[PDB]
Design an enzyme around this catalytic site. Sequence first.
Site, PDB file in Angstrom:
ATOM      1  N   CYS A  10     114.973 105.259  95.380  1.00  0.00           N
ATOM      2  CA  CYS A  10     114.775 105.799  96.274  1.00  0.00           C
ATOM      3  C   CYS A  10     113.641 105.336  97.065  1.00  0.00           C
ATOM      4  CB  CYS A  10     113.783 106.763  94.209  1.00  0.00           C
ATOM      5  SG  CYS A  10     112.486 107.958  94.964  1.00  0.00           S
ATOM      6  N   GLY A  11     113.833 106.790  97.855  1.00  0.00           N
ATOM      7  CA  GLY A  11     112.915 106.678  98.938  1.00  0.00           C
ATOM      8  C   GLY A  11     111.541 107.020  98.694  1.00  0.00           C
TER       9      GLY A  11
END
Length: 138
Positions: A10-11
Amino acid sequence: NITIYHNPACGTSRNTLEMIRNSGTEPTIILYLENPPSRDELVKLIADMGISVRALLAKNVEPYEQLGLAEDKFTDDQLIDFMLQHPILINRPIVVTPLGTRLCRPSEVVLDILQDAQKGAFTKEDGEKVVDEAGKRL
Ligand SMILES: [Cs+]
Ligand SMILES: [Cs+]
Ligand SMILES: [Cs+]
Ligand SMILES: [Cs+]
């Protein structure tokens, strides 16, 4: 003393981890999908985060969809127990420091609870500027 409940895929989670590191400390990294908090720990986390149980729920994951969690038919404790039984339902990242606990969405929310200032400018992995070299939030 910092802990991050991290999802490396997840960025938002990656950006939050790099801002913790750019404040000069290496946190404890808990991969919550594989090691989620216990029930008492989860309750505390939520209490300390200042958000509703429902606000921690990740939408667009299989259990949220198939369990019908979008509908308003669940008590907070039913939602907590779904989170313990299906940890991908816990949104991410959660960061705990001596100053407090936050769901760091967006990632720069973590700047509220990091004790030490960013050591230099910080730019998110997609190029979005967060803090300049002087330390000003952009
Ligand atoms: Cs645990
Ligand atoms: Cs701060
Ligand atoms: Cs600086
Ligand atoms: Cs993005």
